[PDB]
Design a protein around this ligand. Sequence first.
Ligand SMILES: [Tb+3]
Ligand SMILES: [Tb+3]
Length: 194
Amino acid sequence: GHQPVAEERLSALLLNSSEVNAVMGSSSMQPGKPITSMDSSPVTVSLPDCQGALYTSQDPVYAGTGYTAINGLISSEPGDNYEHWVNQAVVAFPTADKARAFVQTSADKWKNCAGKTVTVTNKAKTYRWTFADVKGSPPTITVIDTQEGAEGWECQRAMSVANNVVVDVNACGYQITNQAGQIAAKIVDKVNKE
Ligand SMILES: [Tb+3]
Ligand SMILES: [Tb+3]
């Protein structure tokens, strides 16, 4: 079987509520409404090409890449002070080649963000985030970013590709090590079984 994943099957690739909870160490995370388009809400990053290194599914990042469809979910415990937060998305491309090219581009951009602090402005609010080094083994990339302050809030970004599908994950919390890497690998397993 060498057929690509159909656009209409993207939602079946995401992790369910049990799976998200299990990775994150929670029993109460809940998903929001399906996300079915790229995010074009404005955000300013002091190094503009680090936008994708901070957030999944960003319009300025995916624009022009040939993607055909995106399906995602954001999950967290209820309330304003959730312990865990996950944004998981899968992005369909016409071919494996185009999907892989996008991850390669992402790897180039993330490597220029590694080991740097950037300033991010959103809704007239400004915060600084510090990137660790880019990790992972082909075709997966990961990087941990840490929000300034004594909270210790952090996010791990993970991106991978299988078949014609790019897997794009942001997992955040106070005890981040490789949750986004785990999520990505589980989504890749779902792509593989399509
Ligand atoms: Tb957003
Ligand atoms: Tb906060």
